[PDB]
């Protein structure tokens with residue numbers, strides 16, 4: 001009974017979360033997961049500002065309304081070489097990573113590690129936050145509020 005959450009630096013409060021090392025988050029789980037970080041799904045405008053401060057990934061994730069990949073540098077294997085906030089148009093499937101937005105984060109790039117999951121609820125799952133530098137924070141809890149996600 002374990003969930004691992006790989007997290008990134010924050011850029012203007014926006015960060016990326018990947019669950020269990022693969023695309024595995026539904027839209028409802030995404031919202032609940034951001035909730036556990038005292039965060040929300042970013043708006044498009046919040047994502048564009050994060051982009052402008054240096055945020056890019058090579059992974060699809062939810063924002064409010066769409067599934068996107070922020071890209072600064074063109075790369076042929078990330079969002080088909082596009083730059084900007086690339087919006088997924090056509091897909092059969094429903095599970096992605098997520099982006100989250102924490103209003104209390106610093107305004108520009110914050111590449112310190114995440115050391116807490118402040119708004120998790122009581123529960124039986126060992127949840128481990130894994131930072132890009134390998135540092136880890138664990139706690140027992142739950143964040144999913146929808147039966148179909150559990």
Ligand SMILES: Cc1cc(N)c(N)cc1Cl
Nearest residue numbers: 037102112113114115116
């Ligand atoms: C929820 C949260 C916790 C910590 N420690 C940091 N550093 C960043 C975020 Cl977004």
